[PDB]
């Protein structure tokens, strides 16, 4: 069967709006289970540096008891049915999701009603969550990848609320109080900025009725008439390096500014990442991998690993690479990476563009398997693009690219640009800004 009607037979996401502006989206499948979640676009971009650890510590406190269900009641109600409860918070989103069976759908929508609306906070609970979140920051300090991405976010978005981390600093955690969490939850948890998403064996009318029963109490009116607007952040080409020579391996991330969510060009840039790919020391391909950077990394024994990333935020983003390697290769590997980027400016052919198109097709269909990633895609699509883009539209956008437009978008976004460099480990051979900036343009043209 041809891929087009294979994509067409996937059911469409159904989206409805309540009276308060709350968005309700559901996707039906043949599965016996379901995943129901709440997505609120309230992250560290909206925190004004007096509440830098508000969202992370609030989602720490969200499952420790509500108003009607104190302490062990909600966890006993959600664990007696075998449901799994998860939450996370990015720099622009905040998600509370539950995986459960299809029978217990009124129970799960009632629980997601009373978690995000009637959360109860207490002094012993807030102090024990304070020492828990301090120990969690202490144990997350030793993972080098999160440190390098936090350094890159700090040095790429200086003077803007996109630099500050999701967890926040230790001083703001030590100085946070009940009233800051209360009014942050009051001004940031509003119905027009809320999506209730569901994926799996779900009836849309039943969940719409239950959402009208439970989620129709939001107090969406501006209490202080303070509209939180999205200030456009500026990408600053800079370089942060954390030299510490007792670490065994060095992590270096190099990233230029991305277009954003609304620009379709990142889709083309996605194909560019599918040209460059990724490599680990545990890959079974060996030497004959199609990516030239991976082949020269295994052929010359350069890296422990490298990975190409494209993070997108509202009107901005970071597109680049991250590699962990020993010290004595770092400079050399940087050169190879830059050469590959400039190949995407000039020597893009039909073969690697077609291979990147096929890899991106397999990535965007294979990721949306199971209820949880489909529900995640639904929530992030209704929060970022404002609608759920169908996968046939993704295929139509993927098929439209060729080597000419891929190489001119790569010349638009990589050629003669100022990158952002973050490093951690034995990074003495990591070059200055001048060598990297000179290497991000060829002299032959």
């Amino acid at each position: 069967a041809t891929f087009a009607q294979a994509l067409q037979s996937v059911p469409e996401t159904q989206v409805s709006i309540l009276d308060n502006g709350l968005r309700v989206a559901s996707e039906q499948s043949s599965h016996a289970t379901c995943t129901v979640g709440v997505w609120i676009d309230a992250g560290s971009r909206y925190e004004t540096e007096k509440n830098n650890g508000a969202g992370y510590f609030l989602e720490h406190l969200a499952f420790k008891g509500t108003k009607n269900r104190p302490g062990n009641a909600l966890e006993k109600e959600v664990e007696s049915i075998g449901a799994h409860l998860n939450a996370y918070s990015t720099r622009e989103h905040t998600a509370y999701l539950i995986k459960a069976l299809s029978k217990d759908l009124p129970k799960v929508v009632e629980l997601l009603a009373d978690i995000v609306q009637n959360s109860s906070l207490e002094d012993s609970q807030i102090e024990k969550e304070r020492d828990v979140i301090l120990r969690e920051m202490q144990e997350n300090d030793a993972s080098m990848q999160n440190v390098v991405f936090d350094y890159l976010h700090a040095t790429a978005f200086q003077g803007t609320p996109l630099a500050q981390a999701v967890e926040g600093p230790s001083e703001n955690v030590r100085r946070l109080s009940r009233t800051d969490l209360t009014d942050y939850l009051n001004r940031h948890y509003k119905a027009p900025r809320m999506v209730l998403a569901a994926a799996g064996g779900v009836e849309h009318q039943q969940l719409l009725d239950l959402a009208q029963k439970h989620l129709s109490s939001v107090s969406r009116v501006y209490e202080e008439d303070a509209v939180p607007g999205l200030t456009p952040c500026r990408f600053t080409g800079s370089e942060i390096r954390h030299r510490d020579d007792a670490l065994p391996l060095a992590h270096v991330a190099i990233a230029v500014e991305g277009p954003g969510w609304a620009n379709p060009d990142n889709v083309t840039l996605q194909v560019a990442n599918a040209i460059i790919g990724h490599y680990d020391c545990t890959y079974g391909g060996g030497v004959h991998l199609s990516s030239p950077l991976a082949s020269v990394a295994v052929a010359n024994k350069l890296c422990q690993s490298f990975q190409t990333f494209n993070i997108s935020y509202s009107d901005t983003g970071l597109l680049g690479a991250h590699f962990v390697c020993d010290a004595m290769s770092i400079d050399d590997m940087v050169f190879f990476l830059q050469g590959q980027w400039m190949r995407l400016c000039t020597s893009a052919t039909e073969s690697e563009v077609t291979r990147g198109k096929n890899i991106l097709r397999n990535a965007l269909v294979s990721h949306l398997d199971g209820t949880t990633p489909v529900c995640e895609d639904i929530g992030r699509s209704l929060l970022t693009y404002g609608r759920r883009i169908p996968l046939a539209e993704w295929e139509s956008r993927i098929q439209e690219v060729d080597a000419q437009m891929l190489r001119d978008i790569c010349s638009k976004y990589f050629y003669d640009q100022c990158p952002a460099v973050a490093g951690y480990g034995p990074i003495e051979q990591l070059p200055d800004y001048n060598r990297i900036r000179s290497g991000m343009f060829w002299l032959r043209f």
Partner: peptide
């Protein structure tokens, strides 16, 4: 904590 650090203000040098 690695979240305790942030870049200094480069306002006197930036354009």
């Amino acid at each position: 904590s690695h979240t305790d650090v942030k870049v200094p203000d480069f306002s006197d040098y930036r354009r």
